[PDB]
Design a binder for this molecule. Structure first.
Ligand SMILES: O=C(C[C@H](C(=O)O)C1CCCCC1)Nc1ccc2ccc(-c3nc(-c4ccccc4)cs3)cc2n1
Ligand SMILES: [Mg+2]
Lengths: 222, 211, 235, 250, 231, 240, 244, 233
């Protein structure tokens, strides 16, 4: 029997800063125990200061991204070159996903950018279109390895102030872009050690009011 | 998931948890399980998140169009029915949605339960999700119509806490809402971890747990 | 006979030109755009004193930020309003935002030329679409059955249109207040109307960023009419 | 393309006339004479084989047609319209009756079906009425022998005897004098030949006349033996020789 | 006369009057100019207002990053045809990862307009279009007539009084074709060309509309104070 | 399918087919609607050219759309049945999807919309019918009276008449009906409705039909004798 | 294109009349007269066949009176072919109702359905209307004995006595004169035949030029019987009433 | 939904400094039966592209016709069909990828795995993979079926990453491809000795080599192998 779905592996990570946002993902593409590519880009600049990554089944992921990029193009045509806000793009993507409620895009999608007040924003989707705005989200193969670490090191969960013994929590101080990138790199280096589908390379897209910048880092190739 | 809603003297309370799971893995600690349809209408969420969001945001479209056409606010009865009729079209197709439509209209406060089968029930009290049994115990033994807004908010909050404790797929935080004739009022996000220890001390409950 | 989509030797669509003649027979509707808001006013024109005038609905809400006035065969406007309301709310569903006034107007105008041998004839009604959005601010559009729409600082449509438009030519300036615009619509309506203008045979409305689209009470309009009479008697 | 004539081509005029039907009847009037006579033990239908050229083989053109084993038809007016009506009449006898009830339809109901087809051409979009009048003769168990006329309007009437086409007015007068309720089939054939001779100008013989009968069952024409209840068709077309034999006793 | 009731009827001399009447609607429309060099292609359009309170009707529409047009005649028909071009440009990108050739875009517009001239019930399009673009074979300018005729040109003009601008471009042919790597000078030549079609009125800040596309220049439209530089 | 555009604009900006449909309404028997303080009355003319009629079974001029709303008309009788059927279906469809009966204004807006649709759809002609729609909204004691016409426009009326010689009875209503003080009782409202028809009807025998609609689905049709008593009292006061 | 040849069958005149309906009514005025009379104990249907011939087979002929079901019958005036189309539709409708509700269809409901079909041909489709007028004679347990008529406009009305076809003006005056409410079937039979005998365009009214039918509760106990009269039975009732 | 009947095995390819190389054997298998021995599975499109196909042969022949029709259609009303507006490898691939994903979305796939190898207008190397699921990816080396498991490891020793491409010559790349084809003949039960090889170079153009054979095979050591453990004779 024909199985229309597949699993291309990969892992993605989105973090929202105070005035910036990052969307990272490894560059390894796989089927079963084989490597297809050590560098196959997974996170895309979709225009209007929005970045996107559809992780899971690469054929459905490429189709969704391609369709959203197209939706941005037609939003400009139809509404006098108005900029598509991150919240508007998120709602649009919900409707793209739910158009296939009964033959879903097999992907977990994340977008990142800035909201209309200039603050950092990340939105996270399930395959059928449920979405919500988030601060921190790891998606894909090694999501379960990374998210607990981010709960601990970004939101300071289970961390209390010495001397008080559990009475006073550690205060939620904001993180810089340099601090976030460190947590991203360590997240993927740890994931690479314990997850066979994670490795080869790491590509990060950083979003600020100035635009979209890229950073690439090697990962273990075993 | 645990959601509840009940009618009382001074309107309707709506309380939900915030957990989302993918098997044993907790995919989300804080998801919003109440949808703000309009300033006088709320909707809870249980089942498929996507189905609840899509169809209830679509219900909002239809409830807004109603207002423009008739210049009047839609009843809770009619809104609940529109929603149940959408479910009836994808009957058998695999949707999973359990929600309670909460609001205030000409007849007073209103509460309807609606599910994917097209079921539509009016009632004073409802609870859905994997933890509804735990919530019903607290509600049934403490519910009165003579409830004050302060006590009612605590009841719905304490009822979710009961479920978050025992049910593994329920937890995270509690979101509270109070619906009045002047609209709905949000009463905050309450972490269950912090709330639990607080309730234990102040109430004396959960003696079995060491703190 | 002849095709419904036929061109005249001058290069105009017969049916579109004939529908414009029906709009000239319609009751007067005036719109004035200012930096404090857009004002919309209409002549009700009841055919008999037994007709309850408050049931005459020639000013209509499309969304909270968009209003609309009509002139001509007003029955034709109902499906256009229905489409406009659907388009406005559907865009809010797809994009979690208010829709641009121009985009709403363009959506209405796309219906216009969908006729042939689709509907059997063009619409016999013109619309003044007034609203506000964050990008282009307070706007007023004139939507015709040709499918064409022009933006206006001020515009009059209906039977007293060319006389009213000449008056709007002289009176409008870029520093008009909302109160000044209200009185100006009442003044020009009173000028072109057959019957004597009062709160029962004329209606006012406005759209502001804060309060959105509002149709004025008869008590509120009556005071503005009394305020108009006194300021005209003042010189 | 697409048939864009979805409107009626036959309409009422101020005087209440349906023009196209009247004009179709005028076409029938110009047509060659055909007739039908009902006897006690049979029915006869006849017409002239008006050959368009002597090089044409008039045997290949059949004006009298079998519809069912016990029902036959003849016409006056436009030949091509008749031919297609016979095709449809033969088919509707199967689709709307034989495939349901397992037997051939009675004369009156087959006539009713043909009439319906002709009525629809008088009201449906983008068509003209049929330019023929039909004479349908037949037999069935419960109604016995019968003869029907069907006009372009779709109206049908049962007759003891009648004629349509060119010299119908004179022929109907000739039949009124000769017809009675005690006629045998051979007597009706004789009267048919006499009546038809008046409207024919040129040659009058078995090769220029087409004549058929609805009479006794013909087991020799069935094609098989072994089933007692199946006794053969009542419709039979007379041969050229069989006609000439009766013209000597004329 | 007796042969102008619909598009499906030839006259005794072999003319199609409904198409000719549609052509007439273009002549009533406001003037617009098109011209190109080897590196860039430029559109210049005189926008028309209803009165002093009204806005000036937009004349130029973007079809893709590398292609767009200007209109003269029935504006809603231009919206339909430009929407079709947007879809075709977009089909070429999504399916073939290929930018649509300007010449092929003209062939598609020709065939779409033609179907409306040979069938009963419909009508010809009542608008003329000037398509500019930059593809793999350099800069291009096309003129579209609703008869179906599409023509590739160095320069042209359509609308009311367009003959003046067309004569100017016919004189200036050898000069403006050589304006390579200088967008401002090519626009100047276009603004000077459209000026030959003006009477009574002159080019103001909310009157003039300009568009350009080239080697390293996406299709962009200039309106308002952005064209005050060229007045 | 038959797609021919029958309702089209003329050079002077008129849709003749819609205007000729109004001429069919002018030919129809007179219908009148009057709303009192706590009721609405619908009066209808019956032309006495047709006697030997069976009044038990003959289609009555006033039709119930729901238990709380009624519809009368003037114009083509056959056309009116199609509108009434559609209206009745929509009334049950509304109760089924929204769980409230239709408001009088909503039902009117629907019927008017159907009439409008038949003025710009291919292959169809406009309805040769104008309607008077009356009733009381659910849980409301304010009387409602609306009018529709072939073009599709509709509006609310304190009192209105349609059909042949409607110009005359409207003249009567305009001078006799006071807005500040409408017919306070059922008697006064019926009396004024009968008086208005007596300006046009001819004989006050079987030519006048009266239907009274009160709040909370209280609808009744008056009999010949009951109406005849109004006819008697009116003329006896007139002899002075 | 095709528009050139379209007569436009569904349009108003400047006076607000439907051309084709009016012209169809003109057609019907030349058809054989049909009369219906309702009594307390039954209904009579009488109708005149148009200029017949001696060679027409009368006993197997039917051009005027048709059976819709056991309780309802119709008299036809106009194009017979058009009438048979509608008659078969009405027969199907009656059977649909009986299958759905397990009760015989009320007379008015059947009449309304056919009248709605006629109405449709005047408002949409671009086709000519049916050139037919019906007199419906029927019985049900709600209203008892009922007479209705419908015409090409799709308008229908109830009657105590009514005529359609030729000379209806003269016929209706004669019926209005001699009809009374307490009348019985045997009296109504006589009235119907006397009216036809005076309004006919023929020289004399004979059995071969008539179709006749009654609907009586003159069936053994509480039930209704339809009687389509045979040629010999029409001949007898003509002698009984003293016309021949 | 179907099942593949007549099938083609591995297609292998790699980038080098001035272009790309692609190869595939000439066999059409019918299950375990090596039924057809003269099947060409490399299909050139113009002088700048070669499409290598594995999987169902009937679907391959269908794709072969789509590509032939694509060339015909591109020439229509195109004076620059043999120049600026000629078909590019990226155009040909995206077309196929669109078709493959559409077919899987109708649950009626083309049961293939395809590699499009070519050189673009600007001299850039093109090498991308697409299969029955619509899944696409690119890499310095690409291989289908068994080639993915056995050939890629050998080809990745030559070009392990992007920076190794300019350091790799056509002689080295061809040597690696030919060695890989020998290894597949040793170890793939649905392979043949006969194969085709194509080189698309930005300077020397398209070189299409047919009727190649696997040579220099090692079998002599087999004589010394006796039994399955304890047997000495
Ligand atoms: O309703 C249920 C599950 C049922 C339950 O616990 O009773 C289960 C019974 C036990 C077996 C499985 C079903 N889950 C809910 C309910 C409401 C929900 C509301 C919003 C969300 C959102 N989830 C994302 C999101 C998540 C993960 C990744 C990306 C986005 C956004 S919003 C998820 C929700 N999930
Ligand atoms: Mg690893």
């Amino acid at each position: 029997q024909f199985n229309p779905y597949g699993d291309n592996g990969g892992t993605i990570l989105g973090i929202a800063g105070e005035d910036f946002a990052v969307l990272a993902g490894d560059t390894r593409n796989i089927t079963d125990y084989s490597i297809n590519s050590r560098y196959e880009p997974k996170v895309f600049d979709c225009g209007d200061n929005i970045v996107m990554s559809a992780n899971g089944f690469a054929a459905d992921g490429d189709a969704l991204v391609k369709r959203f990029k197209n939706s941005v193009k037609w939003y400009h045509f139809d509404h006098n070159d108005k900029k598509l806000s991150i919240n508007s793009a998120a709602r649009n993507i919900q409707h793209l996903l739910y158009s296939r409620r009964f033959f879903p895009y097999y992907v977990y999608n994340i977008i990142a950018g800035l909201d209309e007040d200039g603050k950092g924003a990340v939105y996270s989707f399930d395959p059928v279109g449920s979405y919500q705005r988030e601060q921190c989200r790891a998606g894909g193969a090694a999501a379960s390895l990374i998210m607990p670490f981010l709960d601990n090191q970004v939101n300071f969960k289970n961390q209390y102030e010495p001397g008080t013994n559990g009475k006073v929590k550690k205060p939620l101080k904001y993180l810089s872009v340099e601090e976030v990138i460190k947590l991203v790199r360590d997240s993927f280096t740890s994931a690479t050690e314990r997850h066979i589908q994670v490795g080869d390379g790491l590509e990060i897209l950083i979003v600020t009011k100035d635009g979209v910048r890229k950073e690439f880092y090697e990962l273990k190739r075993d | 998931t645990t959601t509840l809603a009940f009618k009382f003297q001074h309107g309707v309370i709506a309380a939900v948890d915030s957990r989302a799971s993918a098997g044993s893995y907790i995919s989300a600690l804080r998801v919003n399980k109440v949808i703000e349809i309009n300033p006088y209408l709320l909707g809870t969420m249980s089942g498929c998140a996507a189905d609840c969001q899509y169809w209830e945001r679509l219900l909002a479209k239809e409830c807004r169009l109603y207002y423009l056409r008739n210049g009047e606010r839609i009843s809770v009865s009619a809104a609940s029915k529109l929603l149940s009729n959408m479910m009836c079209q994808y009957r058998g197709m695999g949707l999973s949605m359990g929600s309670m439509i909460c609001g205030w209209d000409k007849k007073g406060p209103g509460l309807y339960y609606v599910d994917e089968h097209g079921t539509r029930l009016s009632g004073n009290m409802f609870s859905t999700g994997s933890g509804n049994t735990y919530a019903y115990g607290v509600l049934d033994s403490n519910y009165k119509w003579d409830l004050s807004v302060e006590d009612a908010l605590y009841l719905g909050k304490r009822s979710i806490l009961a479920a978050a404790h025992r049910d593994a797929y329920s937890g995270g935080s509690v979101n509270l809402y109070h619906v009045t004739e002047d609209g709905w009022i949000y009463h905050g996000n309450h972490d269950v971890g912090e709330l639990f220890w607080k309730v234990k001390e102040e109430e004396g409950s959960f003696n079995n747990v060491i703190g | 006979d002849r095709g419904v989509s036929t061109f005249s030797p001058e290069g105009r669509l017969f049916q579109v030109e004939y529908s414009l003649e029906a709009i000239k027979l319609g009751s007067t509707a005036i719109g004035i755009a200012t930096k404090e808001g857009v004002v919309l006013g209409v002549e009700k024109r009841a055919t008999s004193p037994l007709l309850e005038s408050d049931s005459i609905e020639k000013i209509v809400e499309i969304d909270r930020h968009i209003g609309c006035a009509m002139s001509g065969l007003t029955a034709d406007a109902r499906s256009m309003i229905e489409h406009a309301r659907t388009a406005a709310v559907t865009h809010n569903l797809y994009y979690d935002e208010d829709i641009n006034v121009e985009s709403l107007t363009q959506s209405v105008c796309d219906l216009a030329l969908r006729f042939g041998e689709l509907m059997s004839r063009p619409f016999g009604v013109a619309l003044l679409i007034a609203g506000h959005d964050a990008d282009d601010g307070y706007q007023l559009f004139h939507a015709e059955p040709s499918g064409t729409f022009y933006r206006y600082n001020a515009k009059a449509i209906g039977s007293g249109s060319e006389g009213a438009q000449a008056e709007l030519l002289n009176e409008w300036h870029s520093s008009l207040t909302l109160k000044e615009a209200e009185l100006l619509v009442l003044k020009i309506l009173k000028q072109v109307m057959e019957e004597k203008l009062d709160e029962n045979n004329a209606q006012l409305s406005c759209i502001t960023k804060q309060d959105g689209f509002k149709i004025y009470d008869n008590e509120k309009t009556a005071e503005l009419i009394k305020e108009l009479k006194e300021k005209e008697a003042a010189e | 393309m697409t048939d864009r004539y979805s409107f009626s081509l036959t309409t009422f005029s101020p005087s209440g006339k349906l023009g196209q039907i009247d004009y179709a009847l005028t076409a029938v009037k110009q047509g060659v004479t055909s007739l039908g006579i009902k006897a006690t033990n049979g029915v006869v239908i006849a017409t002239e084989k008006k050959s368009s050229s002597p090089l044409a083989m008039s045997e290949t053109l059949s004006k009298v047609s079998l519809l069912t084993p016990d029902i036959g038809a003849v016409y006056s007016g436009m030949g091509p319209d008749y031919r297609v009506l016979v095709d449809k009449s033969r088919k509707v006898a199967h689709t709307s009756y034989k495939r349901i009830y397992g037997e051939y339809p009675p004369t009156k109901l087959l006539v009713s079906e043909v009439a319906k087809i002709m009525q629809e051409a008088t009201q449906s979009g983008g068509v003209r009425p049929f330019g023929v009048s039909l004479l349908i003769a037949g037999h069935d168990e419960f109604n016995g022998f019968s003869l029907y006329q069907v006009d372009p309007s779709g109206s049908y009437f049962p007759w003891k005897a009648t004629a349509i086409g060119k010299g119908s007015v004179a022929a109907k007068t000739f039949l009124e004098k000769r017809w009675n309720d005690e006629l045998e089939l051979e007597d009706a054939i004789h009267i048919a030949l006499l009546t038809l001779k008046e409207s024919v100008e040129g040659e009058f013989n078995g090769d220029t006349i087409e004549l058929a009968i609805i009479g006794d069952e013909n087991p020799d024409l069935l094609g098989y033996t072994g089933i007692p209840t199946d006794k053969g068709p009542r419709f039979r077309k007379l041969t050229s020789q069989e006609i000439n034999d009766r013209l000597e006793a004329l | 006369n007796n042969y102008d009731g619909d598009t499906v009827t030839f006259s005794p001399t072999g003319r199609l009057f409904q198409v000719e009447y549609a052509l007439e609607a273009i002549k009533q429309g406001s003037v617009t100019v098109g011209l190109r060099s080897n590196t860039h292609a430029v559109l210049v359009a005189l926008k028309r207002n209803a009165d002093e309170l009204s806005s000036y009707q937009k004349k130029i529409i973007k079809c893709d990053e590398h292609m767009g047009l200007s209109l003269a005649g029935l504006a809603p028909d231009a919206r339909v045809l430009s929407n079709y071009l947007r879809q075709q440009c977009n089909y070429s990108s999504l399916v073939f990862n290929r930018k649509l050739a300007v010449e092929r875009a003209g062939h598609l517009l020709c065939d779409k307009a033609q179907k409306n001239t040979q069938s009963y019930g419909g009508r010809p399009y009542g608008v003329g279009l000037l398509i500019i673009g930059y593809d793999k074979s350099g800069a291009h300018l096309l003129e579209f007539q609703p008869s179906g005729n599409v023509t590739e040109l160095y320069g042209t003009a359509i609308g009311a009084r367009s003959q003046g601008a067309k004569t100017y471009l016919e004189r200036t042919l050898d000069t403006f074709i050589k304006i390579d790597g200088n967008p401002d000078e090519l626009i100047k030549a276009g603004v000077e060309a459209i000026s030959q079609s003006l009477r009574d009125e002159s080019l103001t800040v909310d009157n003039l509309s300009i568009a350009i596309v080239g080697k390293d220049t996406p299709f962009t439209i200039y309106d308002g104070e952005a064209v005050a530089k060229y007045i | 399918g038959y797609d021919r555009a029958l309702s089209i604009f003329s050079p002077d900006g008129h849709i003749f087919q819609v205007e000729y449909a109004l001429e069919a309404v002018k030919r129809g028997t007179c219908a009148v609607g009057v709303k009192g303080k706590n009721c609405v009355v619908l009066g209808c003319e019956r032309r006495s050219t047709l006697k030997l009629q069976d009044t038990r079974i003959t289609p009555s001029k006033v039709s119930k759309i729901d238990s709380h709303v009624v519809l009368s008309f003037s114009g083509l009788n056959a056309d009116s049945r199609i509108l009434i059927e559609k209206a009745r279906v929509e009334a049950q469809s509304h109760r089924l999807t929204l769980e409230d009966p239709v408001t009088v204004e909503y039902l009117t807006r629907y019927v008017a919309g159907v009439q409008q649709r038949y003025t710009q759809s291919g292959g169809v002609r406009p309805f040769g019918v104008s309607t008077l729609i009356a009733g009381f909204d659910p849980r409301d004691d304010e009387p409602k009276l609306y009018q529709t016409e072939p073009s599709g426009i509709y509006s609310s009326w304190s009192a209105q008449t349609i059909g042949r010689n409607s110009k005359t009875v409207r003249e009567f209503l305009e001078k006799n009906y006071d807005r500040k003080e409408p017919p306070a009782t059922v008697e006064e409202c019926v009396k004024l409705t009968v008086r208005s028809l007596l300006e046009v009807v001819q004989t006050g025998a079987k030519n006048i039909e009266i239907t009274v609609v009160k709040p909370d689905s209280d609808i009744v049709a008056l009999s010949s004798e009951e109406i005849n008593q109004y006819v008697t009292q009116i003329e006896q006061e007139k002899q002075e | 294109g095709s528009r050139r040849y379209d007569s436009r069958t569904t349009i108003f005149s400047p006076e607000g009349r439907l051309y084709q309906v009016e012209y169809a009514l003109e057609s019907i005025s030349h058809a054989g007269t049909a009369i219906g009379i309702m009594a307390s104990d039954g209904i009579v249907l009488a109708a005149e066949r148009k200029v017949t011939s001696t060679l027409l087979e009368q006993d197997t002929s039917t051009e005027k009176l048709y059976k819709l079901n056991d309780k309802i019958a119709v008299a036809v005036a106009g194009l017979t072919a058009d009438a048979e189309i509608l008659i078969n539709t009405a027969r199907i409708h009656a059977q649909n109702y009986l299958k759905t509700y397990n009760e015989d269809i009320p007379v008015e409901i059947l009449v309304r359905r056919l009248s709605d079909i006629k109405q449709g041909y005047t408002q949409h489709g671009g086709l000519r209307p049916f050139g037919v007028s019906f007199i419906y004679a029927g019985y049900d347990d709600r209203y008892g004995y009922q007479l209705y008529t419908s015409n090409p406009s799709g308008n229908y009305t109830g009657w105590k006595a009514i005529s359609v076809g030729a000379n209806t003006s003269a016929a209706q005056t004669l019926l209005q004169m001699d009809y009374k409410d307490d009348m019985k079937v045997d009296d109504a039979i006589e009235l119907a035949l006397k009216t036809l005998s005076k309004t006919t365009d023929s020289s004399a009214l004979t059995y071969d030029r008539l179709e006749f039918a009654t609907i009586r509760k003159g069936a053994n106990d509480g039930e209704v019987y339809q009687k389509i009269f045979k040629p010999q039975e029409i001949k007898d009732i003509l002698v009984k009433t003293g016309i021949t | 939904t179907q099942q593949p009947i007549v099938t083609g095995t591995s297609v292998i390819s790699m980038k080098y400094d001035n272009g790309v190389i692609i190869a595939a054997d000439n066999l059409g298998s019918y299950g375990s039966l090596l039924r057809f021995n003269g099947v060409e599975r490399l299909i050139p499109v113009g002088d700048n592209t070669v499409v290598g196909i594995s999987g169902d042969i009937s679907d391959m022949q269908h794709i072969e016709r789509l590509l032939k029709d694509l060339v015909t259609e591109n020439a229509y009303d195109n004076p620059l069909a043999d120049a600026e507006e000629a078909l590019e490898p990226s155009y040909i691939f995206e077309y196929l990828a669109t078709v493959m994903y559409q077919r899987r979305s109708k649950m009626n796939p083309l049961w293939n795995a395809i590699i499009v190898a070519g050189v673009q207008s600007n001299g850039d190397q093109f090498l991308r993979y697409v299969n029955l699921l619509g899944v696409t990816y690119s890499s310095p080396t690409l291989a289908t079926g068994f080639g993915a498991h056995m050939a890629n490891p050998l080809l990745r020793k030559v070009v392990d990453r992007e920076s190794d491409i300019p350091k790799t010559t056509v002689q080295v790349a061809e040597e690696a491809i030919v060695n890989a084809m020998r290894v597949l003949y040793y170890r793939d039960a649905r392979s043949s000795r006969n194969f085709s090889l194509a080189i698309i170079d930005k300077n020397t153009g398209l070189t299409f080599k047919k009727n190649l054979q696997v040579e220099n095979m090692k079998w002599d050591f087999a004589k010394d192998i006796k039994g399955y453990g304890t047997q000495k004779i």
